[model samples]
Target chain A: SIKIRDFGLGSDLISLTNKAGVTISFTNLGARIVDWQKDGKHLILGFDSAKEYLEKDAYPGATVGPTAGRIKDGLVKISGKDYILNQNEGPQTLHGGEESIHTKLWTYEVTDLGAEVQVKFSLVSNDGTNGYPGKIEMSVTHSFDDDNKWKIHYEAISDKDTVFNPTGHVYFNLNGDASESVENHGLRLAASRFVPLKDQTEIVRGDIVDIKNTDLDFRQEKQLSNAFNSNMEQVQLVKGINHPFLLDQLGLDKEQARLTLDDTSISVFTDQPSIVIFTANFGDLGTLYHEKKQVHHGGITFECQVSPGSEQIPELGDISLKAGEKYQATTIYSLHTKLEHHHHHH
Target chain B: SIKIRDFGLGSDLISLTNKAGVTISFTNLGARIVDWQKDGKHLILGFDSAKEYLEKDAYPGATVGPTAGRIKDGLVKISGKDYILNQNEGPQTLHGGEESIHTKLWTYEVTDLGAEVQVKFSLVSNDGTNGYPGKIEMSVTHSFDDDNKWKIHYEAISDKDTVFNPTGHVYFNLNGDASESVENHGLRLAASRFVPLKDQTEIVRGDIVDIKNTDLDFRQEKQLSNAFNSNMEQVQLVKGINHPFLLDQLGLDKEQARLTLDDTSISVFTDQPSIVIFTANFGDLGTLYHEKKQVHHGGITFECQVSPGSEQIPELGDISLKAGEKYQATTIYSLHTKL
Candidate 1:
């Protein structure tokens, strides 16, 4: 079933509930997902008020970017022409610059498809907007099915040469409250290689290294705190997991990763090339709220998309789209719960 | 006599010593003024190695930006076309977006002009660099005279329409050690109005208000700690004087501001539209340094330039430049001491 309600200051929020007691709520403001729950237990961190999203510096559960990661020096060379981009990080373009699509208003259309509910969010970015040289028409469709699965489909078209890399920046805290740490959660990734970043900046060094014996290796499921507190240099730089792992394949049928907390688990299946796993290490809410503050490592994000900062890495292929070309990607999240087992002996 | 030597990692450092025992040394790496001394006493906070400047996140003493300060979501609409910019701040563009002019290697040309020594640093930004739509040829000339004064002259020309706002991001601590707090330093600005920023984001709300009864009023010299601890909204936002004070005029003929500590004083004279006074309120250089860590309020900056994010304010005029247009600006930092 689909329900539409008012959010802060003339914004509308749409909620889709499946037969299996899973629900997802989102708003037209930035087309951000505000809530995700299974049987009334919140699985994602979000603010209740829309105004808080406008005031806070944190991205929360929003869709980030026309380009989702660091662009070295905010520069990208396209067809023999160099284009400068907006910078938000110290010396790199972070999450698509200052006025990224995450902060813009989006138009949404909701539909009920019997066994599932679908909501499509669209936005138009004019040519040269944000220093990107194209008029882009983009849309993201979020569908919730009765099988306790949430699927996202992204489609974009450009009138000129431009770059497009989008991702769902959702922070998951399976324990219902985001104020608790996610250190005890278990994570596993099907990735054997991960991109290494520079010491002080998020710029990718244009190389993919094996994650064999490193703290980033998640071939088998392990508690997050083990790697988070490891003596690895990358762990010490950002405190926790903030690296983009290169998936084995770039197809929709691949099962890329999985996260488990207590008796619940979530699996990720996506067509994206990489998944940026982040443990909220540097989050500090200050005195912004009257409620409890979300401590460091309180949430985790599995941002499935192309390898961030790939523009500088020629071997990673291209994220650019020529005129009349279509950019498309899909990601699926499936939820599961561990059932209690009982044995009766005669 | 002027001395030129090689600094760390093949960078050239030029030293200018005046007759009155005032000396200033700078490097070709980002054209940063690394050291300033009066009677052999260090007056500015800087690193001993060029590698530190290249490694640290702090700007230290360097030439900042083709556009400095926050650029309101890194957006600038010019000629009916919206141009996206680089962002370094959370959702806003800070200090000219990520790899600003301060991080670039600049070419230098030095000359000993008899009574004074001048070093000109130049760099060319290709069109569409930093998401800006211009091929800009820029130069910053630093001169030191026998009168114990240092002056800076900036000039640029762009082949396409783009924004230009540059400043010298130098932090001063007159007590000779930057690790000490600058709470007792006295400061004054020759302006009566300043811009008010939004609550959390610190974006200019596009309005200028009088500083008469507010804590930002610096008409008469006062201790920096006074306004820093005041209950003003803006002060609480950035923790100190990070606001840009609108100057009374746009000419370098008159002095715009002054800073005094103990027996030393530094006056500012610039042809820019505004002067941003920062108390170094949030500076905390941790283990990133092998040297002593610079504490909060360790120094202060008098960043003189045009109004930041002024593209949104119509009456403040535009920072854009068209093809074949020459942009010229001069900011003179005249050093002084109370005998």
Candidate 2:
């Protein structure tokens, strides 16, 4: 079953239900997945009104882009010309500054595939939107299958050489009740290296260091509480885990990460080069979706995309696309009923 | 007489001739005057195409806005929110930065006023055009009358509170020649105070001082050569007279300034609070509209507007406006010719 309603946020809310009774809801404002549940479980945090989401530092389940994450000091170089963003996050431009796609009321199109439904939200960004050059036609599609796989596909085209690395800043708690300590959930990532963050700014320190001996080593399934309770400088700054992990190149077919809470688990798959994990570290932002403020460590987000700050530093990867070029990438969260352990290779 | 032609710069060229044979040509690109002439003489600097104008730091006879001139560090405050514009100059945002009205191809509408003709060029600026808030529908109209008055009118409306102080950066060499030194032209301004600029960076020092003893005392008709040839520290910093003089008010009725050449003279009237005078000052670009490169002091521009850097330092004057509020300002250059 599928239903649509006005989200009171300048866009529409779309709900799709799968054969096994799994359901998800989305809003075209930011193309965010506001609700995902089965029976009593609400997988992510969201707001009931646009007023609540707007008054807080709520990226929430919103899609963040032209380039998600921070750009140091709000300065960027596009086509060799220096540009400045809104400097939204203190000094850095977190989640694409003020004019990010997260603030747009995208026009959406719905397509139903046998037993599955997809909603594609689109918007046009002017040449200087958020200080980025070139006019971009960007889109994000959310679709769910009967096999319990929720897929997010991204696409964009630009008229000039500009950046386009978008990702959904979806905070998933798996346990459904957001304020119920998400630290109780287990997390894992199939990776070999990770980007360390500067203690204060939370921006990457540029070097892709080894994750072997670090608390971030998710080579095998580990409880997220280990890092959540650590006193390490990087972990202490953001109050919990918030850093990029370089993927080991298994392609979109193989699982890249996994999340487990009680009897339920989720395996993540993506074609992106890196994934960032952020535990809700910032304190009190209104009474959130569940009418309870999850001050710190209430939900966790998996931001899979090209590494941030790569426009200035080339070591991470190239996220820019030239004029006439197309950008396409996908990520899938395959739901599971039982605990699944990956083959541990030393 | 009025005529229109494609300007080869993503816009049209409009030519309006007055009864006294004075003629001026404008392009919708920047809404600038490419040519202003009566007989064998030209008054301002300009180029023939967009490519030539864009390649060089040629503001030419362009309309520069949303707030003309510099903002300290390209930062602005509107409705108490600080926004950063592109740092086009060494440190400041000169002429509204990269996405200035000087760079846009405006849509034009023509109107005939019996003895005069008006060409209004307009554009819509997005909320973040150069990091400004609100959507601005801005327009600049160029009109010439049978009495030989060339008037430039500005009007704008914003959807939110944003800055809006526009001025035409029209450089005039009253002798009607490009390479001739503008110091030969006599100038006068009905101003009592002036803003001083700092050396090196050229941003204003903020303190509005009296012009009684300074070389900027243009209270009486004086030769521009006096300042052009002065050894004053402020005069030497910008190479010539490039500071703003606070105007005596009249609501656009009285003559604010005047320029005199051999047998021809021009009187300027505006509703603005201050007028900035720039004597070329900078070095050369490509061959100009007259095919001569003006390295320095070849022409002088009278920039009439609300003072620059007034956003950060409110003592200068307020250029910011609120939504639903309309902005209207006018400037006129009435011409006279006789021996």
- The two-chain DockQ for each candidate, comma-separated, is 0.01, 0.05
> Taking the tens digit of each residue's C-alpha lDDT, what string does model 1 give over B251-308?
8888888888878888889988888887777655452323756678888888888877
Worst 10 residues of 1 chain A by lDDT: A337-346
Compared with the true structure, model 2 gives a TM-score of 0.54
- TM-score, one value per model: 0.52, 0.54
Second chain TM-score, each model = 0.95, 0.95
Q: Give lDDT tens digits, candidate 2, residues A1-346.
A: 8887645423456889999999888877677888888675887787776545657645888888888888888777767767777577888988877646776556567789977788888766666765676567888899998988888999999878887788988888776765666777777788898777765887778677887767777788788777887886778777787888889885998889988876778889999988988887765543465677575777888899988867555888877688989999998887887665432221
Point out where model 2 deviates above 4 Å.
A1-346, B283-287
Per-residue lDDT for B14-61 in model 2, tens only? 788878788888877677888888785787677766556766645888
Candidate 1 ranges beyond 4 A from true positions = A283-290, A339-346, B1-339
Supply the TM-score of chain A against the true chain A for every candidate structure.
0.94, 0.93
Instruction: List native contact recovery per candidate, as a fraction of 1.
Output: 0.00, 0.10
The alpha-carbon deviation from the true structure for residue B291 of candidate 1, after best TM-score superposition, in angstroms, is 77
Clashing pairs in 2: none
Best by lDDT: 2
CAPRI quality band, candidate 2: incorrect
